[PDB]
Nucleic acid binder design. Structure first.
Ligand code: 5GP
Ligand code: GMP
Lengths: 436, 437, 437, 437
RNA sequence: GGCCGCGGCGCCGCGAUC
RNA sequence: GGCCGCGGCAGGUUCGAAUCCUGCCGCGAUCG
RNA sequence: GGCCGCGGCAGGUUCGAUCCUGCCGCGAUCG
């Protein structure tokens, strides 16, 4: 039965007592250090509401300073306080330079911000986090386990987190959904009837039809909490919910193992497909995931669009970011194209331009077709691999700011059996739909 | 060298020698003698009557004029009786109505029945128009016959003389109107350089204006376009030749180009460098007139071309040739081979019902979501243009024209690779690929 | 009493009652609910969406909008797939694209797939041009829905509403464009009296001018004639009705005419008095839609009518009728019986050879000369119009329309006399002969 | 492994586990409690009472006894009332007579009213025999319950268990009589190898003899055939099964068979190799029980088959499937296409009266004499089996069964070619064509 | 799918119409 | 209620039906 | 800081512009 499955799930989902005592002792000690300095602070985030998922323990503390101190005034000051409270700290750059460190083994964040009267003086996202907490701290009580079930259900299917690496559901969005539908089970049941135009207005407690999938923030009606939830991940979630209800299982809460596959079998698969499968290798820029992945996504789309234009008929693309290198994977229906192509000339009555078009020397004679001139010309490349070698060599600049600059410094085109040796088997299996 | 020198030298290739003219006069006299014996009203029309016929293209046209009171059937009976009774060796041909083609003292002759109309307003049949055409031209073309012959020779040598569907070019009647309008061959070539696809040449009103298509107003019937069957591409070819001519005149324009005759090993080498897929569809030529066959060969080629487009084989050009026995549909494709797998479109994720059906079917690989919609990897039936066309010719033979489609249904085959170079199509392949000498 | 009062009362015959309106509103709401569950882009268009549908003719037209990237096959797959899922008791119909017709909460619904085009130039399909028609009228027709609704009822009551081949009248779209042009039903009727067979009505430019045909310019496409399939005769009828309507306004114009059925005995006496020959060609109705059948019944009757004209049976008028199981081609001729002997045309007296052949034939009677031509007395194969058609229909079945032709080849019979009046054709017979009361 | 171990292992797949028995026992004693409170005559019969129900097919049967002092109308009233006032979640099923079916503490139950009766000399309703059937078996089956279960499982695993019209196999009652007769499952299988279509098994007389048809004599009524609804073909499939089992015993005979799995492309290619015409008649499934639906599908499938034979399309076999919404009638024909023309037999040459009538019809070709009789060429309305069935389904809907025929009268569609392989009927197509894994 | 018109010599092909 | 086998009728197909295609009434059988 | 959507300029492609590419401004998202 479902009720027993969700009970079994709580084991994988709820943090153990040791993890709580580790955080509780880190919290109580973190306060003593903040009280002595006599600074205005507040505990928020998934910890303050006791909704953090198992293994993902993090303490979020916000410093509430007056409105008088503008921008860089409290930035450096709040940063200074973060050092005199944390053990092994390090400066991390978000919208505002905040401080990430550790206190008695537990990771901690210290973000400075304004102390605003109402959510009208909102400047940035950091100014909304306190209001998100204030709105949730009361309503979420007695539903902490419902949140964690949802967070686990999503993280197991790789769609938990609003960061660009995932483009899934935020922890804040999860809690809003539980407050709306009451429980995890009710959320999954109703999600089956979600569409790409569903509007979930939490504050007004109703569901409307809109222009896009829009979860209205109770703090700011103008804001979509699911703004970075991709359309596909929305589609995937709706489907996962449908599958869960038809045949409930604890498997939905356990992560999947990458498809084990021998390079020889993988070769035999590509042969059966008759496609060209290759990858663009290059060194990973030293930048944050929130900057890296949107760029890899761009570089992929750009090369993909180039392959379309050059009539190589690409099927799908993919990318992987390892420790030192990045890979842009492609699969095209055309292994090789004729050297000859057709270049369109002007209409026959346009004598001036026809003369210019015909003046160019070519191996074969131009011709007329539908009252317009045409000419046989030669391609510079006949394979998709050679085409991308050319594109990545001349159009490196449009492949993302940092990714484009790395490709400028170095890149290979790896295909055939040599590709299967690279650590990209998990993604090649995914984009081709290999099953076993 | 000089313009007038070339035009003078061109007349030799284009004017009938005095022997051919004598051959025609002798038949003409005998033909009139046999007709007068029968008490029928006739009229010598066409190229021969106006003395504007091309060298080695002698053919007499005689139209029989009957009262309007006659029925279509009576018109025919009297026509065929008088046809057979005047020609040494006749045969019944068809064109709107039956007429009699035959020979008289070596010279070929056409005897056509039509109504004797006083006003050019009672024109039901097109044959009823010919007497009016001749009537309008016999006076205005006098002195200009050599100019007409030049234009005809210029057009013929460049394969665009004749309004039949095999040529889709300039009719002889059209050539005469052009000379009457412009005054001479040279002046026609000159002004032709500024012809557009919207040019309207109205001889009867003596003006040039703009229209929706290239229109040559018939002086006999202003609603008729004399250049109706002049294709856009052949119009373009003519305008371009006229420019090429005035830029660098030459007697070569009036001579036919000997077909590109190359060996099957060089032809293999050209296709090799082009990197394309060249192949053909061989089948038996239907037993029909060219005016039926060629429009169907066109349709056949177009349909297969459109098929190759849809199937992503990326065709460059198509061509066709007709032997006395067989017919060939030629094609060149940029893709010699395509992958087995392809993307099959599924429903949007919101569809509980259809997504279930879509995912129900068995496939070698997992379907996936993209842009909020399900897609699935499926396999192609064919992976080369040759096999794709083989499949299409077998299943969609009916769309390749009536007579051509039925013939393909009985028997066809895909002659590809080097085996095709042995077939008699090399001249068409070189034209199709733009091969130089 | 006065025109304005008649119209005010005519509105009742024409506007949908509150119950029929609500019937649609409930279907619409349910239809939208189903379409939203599938995430498909759609739009309610046509007569219902603009709230101009005639009383009793409630029909909802939803158009599915797909990207231009979609292949025609994909366009059709998704369309059909969505239709069946949204309609209760669906029925696959065919036009330009295969679409789905069905029922939702007791209301008729059409679901047509098409392309979501931003440019009205990318139009290739007629279903692609519908979404543009709707948007051009959506704002303009607002506040005039009852004026359109009058024009429809006025037309339908006189059997000239609908541009199908069965009616060859005014389309619904045409009706709305005319109200937008003249402002109201009354202004449309008043000006229609001055229409001609050359009148052009430019809606976008809001001006009238002369042309070749009766042309109502589509605001979305200047090249298209909205009143293309409006027959010349139905045009004349509408003009006349408008003139008759203003000279003596009546609510009777907005009401259908009674069947006007008469006893077989009266009809027998009428034909006797007229002294004509009235017969029919009966045959099985081809299993084809009306749009294919009626143009063929028109051709069939026309061809047979022309045969009777050639054979001197002097046809007056013709008509046709399609029942459920059979089809009838009705004819009335002034000659019940013609002489067995007739004149056969021979050669002129000069033609010695052919006169010999002509006079050598065995004949009951001697040939003779008349106006320098030999004539002969020969015997007709048939001597009544029924005999003649029985022949022609069997030896020229192939010209009587494709489907109609093959059905006549399978089976047909010439019905006349008492046995014809028993067939379901009396209404058409009376209309043909101009019987009154 | 060997037979003894196979049957041992089979008991696992066959005997209900202690959890299923407990689920039933608690339901029984509870059901008895409610029958004692009202104080009504009742009896537990059927497979449950004798403890022979197959694994997973748990179903309690309880017959309500009533005195003979009741008419056929009074029994259902206080019969169903006692039924509804005993079952928790009850409904109403319709069989021989109205009866209540519902679930009681997990398991479903049937409450059938009937007369008590003294001896089987009455012989009236079918439900009046069930108590006598149980009484005859309850003593003789004790100690053989597992043998019964082995037979029932052996049959169900091969789709021939159950006397319902959807199966036309062996009834549960029949299975128990056989075990009583032969002593065990293994002895039944051994002797069944020598069964014929004329074998008579008399249980009460303990003898086998030859008769007119396969007949298992009911011990209660010698005139009744217990295996009456066992089809001839299923009897054949059983005799063959037993022979295969004894020749090479295996546990696989007790496990149901795989669903096959085949791709549309292979299925298309197969049909191409057969050179046959495969198509289906698709329509909406009438909302009726299987026992009414399947016999009608058999009738419709048969009627159309006989039509295909009669129309010389030479059908090979026919199959049918019933989904939740639609029903399919599958057919395969050796003739994809037939000539337009055919022969019709006329009268003998002496019969002048009828020769005149026969020769009066308008036909495309001349009739001819052959062996003294007159014959005539005539034209078919259709030339393919698809189109032939389309005509037949349209004009003979009424004979394709009551409910099925009515649903076809409303809507049906002929699905041929590759489009048929998309429908959910691949399993039925593979079985029909004898496609091997 | 059928119908009309155009073009070439009723047979074919192409535009318009439902 | 539906299906099946006979018995008596009533239409349709056909030049013409005891016979081929259908429908109604009566009896028997099967299944729920 | 990066990415995405708009708005306005500027190179390139090309026979010439549809396409490609860059710069500035506004808004959105993530850190
Ligand atoms: N179609 C038709 N066949 C008949 C008719 N009467 C008899 N037959 C059939 O004609 C054939 C010859 O008749 P018989 O000599 O057997 O009486 C037989 O097959 C017989 O059944 C009838 O009225 N119509
Ligand atoms: N009227 C008619 N009788 C036939 C035919 N064939 C056989 N017969 C038989 O011939 C006999 C005529 O007396 C009857 O027994 C008929 O059944 C036929 O084609 N027409």
């Amino acid at each position: 039965k479902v009720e027993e499955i969700l009970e079994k799930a709580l084991e994988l989902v709820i943090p153990d007592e040791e993890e709580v005592r580790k955080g509780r002792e880190a919290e109580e000690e973190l306060r003593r250090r903040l009280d002595e300095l006599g600074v205005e602070y507040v505990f928020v985030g998934s910890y303050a509401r006791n909704t953090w998922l198992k293994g993902s323990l993090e303490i979020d503390v916000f410093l509430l300073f007056p409105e008088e101190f503008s921008k860089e005034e409290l930035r450096e000051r709040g940063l200074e306080i973060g050092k005199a409270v944390l053990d092994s700290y390090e400066i991390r750059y978000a919208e505002h330079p905040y401080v990430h460190g550790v206190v008695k083994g537990v990771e901690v964040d210290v973000v400075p911000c304004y102390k605003l009267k109402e959510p009208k003086n909102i400047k940035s996202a950091v100014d909304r986090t306190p209001f998100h907490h204030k709105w949730l701290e009361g309503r979420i009580k007695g539903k902490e386990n419902e949140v964690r079930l949802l967070k686990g259900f999503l993280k197991a299917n790789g769609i938990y987190g609003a960061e660009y690496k995932v483009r899934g559901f935020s922890g804040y969005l999860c809690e809003l959904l539980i407050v709306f539908y009451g429980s995890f089970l009710e959320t999954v049941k109703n999600a089956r009837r979600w569409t790409r135009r569903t509007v979930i207005d939490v504050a007004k407690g109703e569901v409307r039809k809109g222009e896009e999938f829009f979860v209205v923030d109770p703090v700011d009606e103008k804001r979509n909490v699911a703004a970075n939830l991709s359309l596909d991940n929305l589609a995937r979630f709706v489907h996962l919910c449908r599958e869960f209800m038809e045949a409930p299982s604890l498997g939905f809460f356990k992560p999947k193992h990458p498809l084990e596959i021998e390079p020889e079998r993988l070769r035999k698969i590509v042969e059966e497909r008759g496609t060209a499968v290759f990858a663009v290798k290059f060194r990973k820029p030293d930048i944050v995931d929130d900057n890296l992945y949107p760029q890899l996504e761009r570089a992929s789309r750009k090369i993909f669009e180039f392959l379309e234009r050059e009539n190589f008929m690409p099927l799908r693309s993919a990318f992987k970011a390892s420790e030192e290198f990045c890979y842009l994977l492609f699969e095209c229906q055309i292994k090789e194209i004729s050297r000859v192509f057709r270049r369109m000339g002007p209409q026959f009555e346009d004598e001036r331009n026809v003369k210019k078009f015909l003046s160019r020397n070519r191996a074969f004679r131009p011709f007329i077709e539908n009252g317009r001139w045409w000419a046989f010309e030669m391609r510079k490349f006949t394979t998709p691999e050679e085409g991308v070698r050319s594109y990545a060599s001349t159009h490196w600049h449009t492949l993302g700011k940092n990714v484009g600059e790395s490709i400028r410094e170095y890149f290979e085109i790896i295909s055939g059996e040599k590709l299967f040796k690279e650590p990209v088997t998990a993604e090649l299996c995914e984009m081709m739909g290999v099953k076993d």
